[PDB]
């Protein structure tokens, strides 16, 4: 959520949905029914160990 004073607080993070296991480009989906009803902003937290 984005407070009216610029104090972003991070809610829970969700996995991506996918339809096929491949290497080429594709579309990862995040349904807006997973987010809490107060999700104004979002960001990708990506990392490969």
């Amino acid at each position: 959520v984005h407070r009216p004073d610029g104090t972003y607080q991070a809610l829970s993070e969700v996995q991506p949905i996918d339809i096929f296991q491949q290497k080429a480009w594709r579309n990862l989906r995040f349904p807006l029914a997973w987010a809490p009803p107060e999700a104004n902003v979002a960001r990708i937290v990506a990392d490969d160990p």
Binding site: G6, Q21, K23, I44
Partner: protein
Amino acid sequence: LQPVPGQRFGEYGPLGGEDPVGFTPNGVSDTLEPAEPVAANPGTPNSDGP
């Protein structure tokens, strides 16, 4: 989607805010290829395979 205006982006793009470790814009490969083929089962009604 456009980023919220007031932030601290960095040296390239608003896709890493602070010190993006080892994530280069030119990092994408160029031979993206599925590691295993499909290996169709015999009997598919529309296939010219032997």
